[PDB]
Design a protein around this ligand. Structure first.
Ligand code: NAG
Length: 172
């Protein structure tokens, strides 16, 4: 069986967070996973349910850096994005605007457990300005959906949750 136990709208990163550069364009801010969201318990699963995760970014793709997409927020600011299973360290680098397999999946046994997820992003400066500061308002990022497999089914259970980037300021 499966049921939804998480939240549908999720904020990524602390509200009105401020980040400073520590070091060429596009320039990527080394924010680790400070700008993220994670929840180990989004779906409750049991009885042999097999589930993985698909992730999708809705922001426009405005470039490619080191193998993954640069998603645009404004003409001067973009994002590198990772989506995946619960632990931030297992995030899958996102490219494109299609649903992508971000967690290969697992199968619970004949007991009850949960399926979680995580998302984190890193700011990218696409074009510099005279103020050496870049701010972005709250913006929808994309979604993550559970992907049942091996015959498992979502039935009438909610499959998708969404993510919105909390407003932030980048200081250089
Ligand atoms: C309470 C708990 O730990 N659930 C982790 C869950 O968050 C994760 O999505 C899944 C697959 O790695 O394995 C579960 O054991």
């Amino acid at each position: 069986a499966v049921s939804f136990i998480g939240s549908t709208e999720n904020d990524v990163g602390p509200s009105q967070g401020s980040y400073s550069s520590t070091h060429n364009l596009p320039f990527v801010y080394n924010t680790g996973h400070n700008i993220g969201y994670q929840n180990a318990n989004v779906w409750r699963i049991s009885g042999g349910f097999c589930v993985g995760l698909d992730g999708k970014v809705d922001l426009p793709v405005v470039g490619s850096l080191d193998g993954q997409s640069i998603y645009g927020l404004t003409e001067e600011v973009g994002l590198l994005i990772w989506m995946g299973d619960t632990n931030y360290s297992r995030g899958t680098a996102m490219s494109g605007n299609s649903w992508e397999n971000v967690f290969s999946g697992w199968c619970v046994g004949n007991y009850v457990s949960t399926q979680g997820l995580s998302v984190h992003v890193r700011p990218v400066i696409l074009k510099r300005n005279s103020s050496a500061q870049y701010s972005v308002q709250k913006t929808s990022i994309g979604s993550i959906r559970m992907r049942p497999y091996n015959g498992s089914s979502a039935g009438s259970v909610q499959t998708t949750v969404n993510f919105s980037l909390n407003p932030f300021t980048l200081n250089d």
